[PDB]
Chains A and B, each alone.
With several copies, the nearest count.
Chain A
Amino acid sequence: QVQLVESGGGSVQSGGSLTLSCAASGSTYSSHCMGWFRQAPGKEREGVALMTRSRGTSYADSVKGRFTISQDNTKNILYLQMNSLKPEDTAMYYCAAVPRAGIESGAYCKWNMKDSGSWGQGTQVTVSS
Chain B
Amino acid sequence: SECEYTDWKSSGALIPAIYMLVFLLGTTGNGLVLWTVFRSSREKRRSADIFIASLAVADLTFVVTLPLWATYTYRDYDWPFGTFFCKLSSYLIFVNMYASVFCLTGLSFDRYLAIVRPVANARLRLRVSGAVATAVLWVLAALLAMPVMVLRTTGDLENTTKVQCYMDYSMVATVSSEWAWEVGLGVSSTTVGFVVPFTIMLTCYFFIAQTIAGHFRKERIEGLRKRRRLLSIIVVLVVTFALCWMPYHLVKTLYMLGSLLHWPCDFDLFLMNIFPYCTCISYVNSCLNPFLYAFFDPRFRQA
Contacts and interface: CB of A to CB of B under 8 A. Distances in A.
Interface of A: 1-2, 26, 28-31, 33, 47, 50-58, 70-74, 99, 101-113, 116-118
Give the dominant DSSP class at B's interface.
Answer: mixed
A57 to B, nearest CB: 8
Contacts of A117: 175
A74 B2 CA distance: 8
Given A58-B158, A99-B179, A30 B167 contact: no
Given A111-B157, A111-B159, A112-B155, A106 B5 contact: no
A110 B157 CA distance: 5
B281 interface: no
A104 to B, nearest CB: 6
Contacts, number: 122
B160 A55 contact: yes
Give the dominant DSSP class at A's interface.
Answer: loop
B155, B162, B178 — most chain A CB neighbours (10 Å): B178
B261 to A, nearest CB: 10
B255 A50 contact: no
B1 A70 contact: yes
Nearest to B276: A106
A108 B157 contact: yes
A11 to B, nearest CB: 28
Given A102-B182, A107-B272, A108-B158, A2 B175 contact: yes
Contacts of A54: 6-7, 76-77, 158, 160, 162
Contact of B259 (A31, A58, A112): A31
B262 interface: yes
16 contacts: A2-B176, A28-B262, A29-B265, A30-B263, A31-B179, A54-B76, A71-B1, A102-B186, A103-B251, A103-B252, A103-B272, A105-B164, A105-B166, A110-B166, A112-B158, A118-B175
Nearest to A114: B159
B4 interface: yes
Contacts of B162: 54
